[PDB]
Design a protein around this ligand. Sequence first.
Ligand SMILES: Nc1ncnc2c1ncn2[C@@H]1O[C@H](COP(=O)(O)OP(=O)(O)OP(=O)(O)O)[C@@H](O)[C@H]1O
Ligand SMILES: *C(=O)CCCC[C@@H]1SC[C@@H]2NC(=O)N[C@@H]21
Ligand SMILES: [Mg+2]
Lengths: 592, 172, 70
Amino acid sequence: SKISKVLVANRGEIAVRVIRAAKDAGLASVAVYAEPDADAPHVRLADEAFALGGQTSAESYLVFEKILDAAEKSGANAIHPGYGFLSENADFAQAVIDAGLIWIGPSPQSIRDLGDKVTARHIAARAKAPLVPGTPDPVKDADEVVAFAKEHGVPVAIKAAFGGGGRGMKVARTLEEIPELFESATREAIAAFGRGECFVERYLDKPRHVEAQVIADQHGNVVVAGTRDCSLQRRFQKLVEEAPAPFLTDAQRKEIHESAKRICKEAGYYGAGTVEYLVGQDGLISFLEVNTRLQVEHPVTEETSGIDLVRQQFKIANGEPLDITEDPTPRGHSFEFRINGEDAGRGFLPAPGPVTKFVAPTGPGVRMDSGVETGSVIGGQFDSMLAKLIVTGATREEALERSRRALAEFTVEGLATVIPFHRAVVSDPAFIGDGEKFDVHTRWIETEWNNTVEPFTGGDPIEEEDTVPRQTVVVEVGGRRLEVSLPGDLAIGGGGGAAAPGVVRKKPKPRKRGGGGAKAASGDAVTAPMQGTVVKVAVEEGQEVSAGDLVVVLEAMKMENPVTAHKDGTITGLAVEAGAAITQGTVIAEIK
Amino acid sequence: SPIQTDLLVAVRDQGYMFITGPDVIKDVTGEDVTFDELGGADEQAKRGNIHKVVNSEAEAYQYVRDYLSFLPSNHFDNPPIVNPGMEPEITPHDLELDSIVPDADNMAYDMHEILLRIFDDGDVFEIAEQRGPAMITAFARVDGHPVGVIANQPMVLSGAIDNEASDKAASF
Amino acid sequence: DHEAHIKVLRGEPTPEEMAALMAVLASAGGGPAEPVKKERNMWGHPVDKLRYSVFSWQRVTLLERTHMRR
Ligand SMILES: Nc1ncnc2c1ncn2[C@@H]1O[C@H](COP(=O)(O)OP(=O)(O)OP(=O)(O)O)[C@@H](O)[C@H]1O
Ligand SMILES: *C(=O)CCCC[C@@H]1SC[C@@H]2NC(=O)N[C@@H]21
Ligand SMILES: [Mg+2]
């Protein structure tokens, strides 16, 4: 069968991307949106749209029945999962196939095999990919970890067999931390993924993250569209990415290409995917994992190789052989910057808010993939990304120059973003390099970057002078254009004035609690500090707790925030359960 | 004399108020009672005889200055106007209010999350916080002009109006 | 220093141009701009021309208050 109508089971910039690809290919597009996304750009861009209902992802986009019912009612015959959500759920892939639909992605068996990290390591070893030393099977007890660590010398890392998103890895510097770290990792894996299994391996001191884009075919063909460098990471999640991977010897580049092809063929992988490696300061390459979906970074490879990877996914799903027979030769250099709704001046903590203004750059070598526009609203439910800015040039230096220009032009108002960090990094010498190497690494941002970004405040008046009204006027002085901001109470030339009748000005007070030393201890109520979803309740009615004890965990922007008891006493009046949406100031319980 | 005044601010472990002392009470009726029970700062604040309890005399003075900054000198004169004309257009703080009330009816919430957004700034100056905790009486400013605010506090006793809440609202 | 100043948000004037601009603005200044010299004169005030019912609450809230505001 051939794709005729594609249902995009996702949201935001990726949904818009798949819709545009389907439009190019001539196919019909169905979008599925939750209530918070009732007017997102993809809903209006798609040929038709269906309302899943609900507010959280766990009840709108992560429901097989809702997505499949949308497919049935829209008449769609293919389903594209984008990335995230169900794009790597083998059970969902199998359900899609069983329903008689074309699942645009790898096979369920491939998804399971390459999601099980220990099984992935077995496949890589069988394919003879370069691997960092480590226990080939999950450990039994901290004694095994200590035996490995003593044999191989610290540093070391303990990783869950099914963890992901950067949460499933813990690090040990000294042998004393091995037992406690192992216990913590085991309990965290049990709680979060169900599979309480972990292994250990050597920890690279300052690795680079280099990955290879693979176009794989149902007929057995495999092509490597090109490499990428995503060393700039925040919390083991990428922020800035490059293509092709810079400053690699031909030996390294060839090894990455060949090992990627071998791994895909061993796994039986077909469809677009990526093989992620790590390059240590010593220069050695090590296989890290295989992403079985379209990766967020694909635009840089598209720009540098001229391949439309989403349309390649469509062709592979239709079952045709690849039209590409050899690895493309990269042309130029492309950078990609994620426009997250995160404040770099506040530890990159994401926060919702309105998009009161969104003016993307244009011009030479600039591409914008945005799921946001002026007047959009970012709620607390979904990931914090707003858009992706891709800047391409004839070489790395030209790409950096164009990136400086484009980031200077890019403007967003109403909420915080990481544009100030992008603007700083694209000129930081540690990222420019010396023509043969560069100093960044997977922990460079959080431990080496000089964070000079100020906290976001918007237009809120903070100082006494901020209260005075102002008017901006264009002036010309001998032709030169100027913009002058004039206060409403200005007095110059021995005259002028305003607000005569008993007006006083003082520092405005923040829209926060009164700042009493009790730190909310003046009351018994535990209040939700932000809008979010209760994902875990750590106490029970009548439970006695002490100050600092965990009460609940609230998920906002897909990030977890613990809410803890502020005073000793008995928990009472628990009004929340797992999965309940909660607003700021909502009473969770009372410590009476 | 103090009970006739409009505001009573007491230092916590230092200011007491009572008609009769515990010794005389013991002599006449035989009851045993301490000063804290018979007219400590917090006890009187909860009963409504004291509008504010502070920890120190400097805090008392600052409370008095803040309280007077919202009021005219007398019944006839105007009050001071403070920072008129801030933020004349909808702000993200205003837009946060569209989703502040819980979805479920039985859920309680902190009314300060609304009071800190519907006036000029976070300068909501509360009076008699302890008397009726289900009711909030405070001063605020709209466009620089002082206003009194009587609000329900769902976070406390479901926001029901009890005896102390009713009297606090009436007096205010 | 909490004074509200003049900001040149965009542009970079040379000292001569800044001098010219500031001179023009100071000349354009509003002069005395409602000085404090205002004196009270309640003679023939409109409130005193109104008919009030012998029991009108406006005798307190309009007439008395107008005569007493300072
Ligand atoms: N052995 C190691 N030594 C040093 N750093 C490591 C090691 N393993 C992982 N890391 C760092 O931790 C990050 C974890 O990435 P990993 O691909 O394992 O997880 P993930 O992105 O959450 O997984 P998934 O894509 O399967 O959901 C790596 O990108 C790298 O930054
Ligand atoms: C909801 O927003 C779905 C997840 C969107 C982000 C996904 S998660 C997995 C990929 N890795 C990453 O950094 N972003 C992608
Ligand atoms: Mg990964």
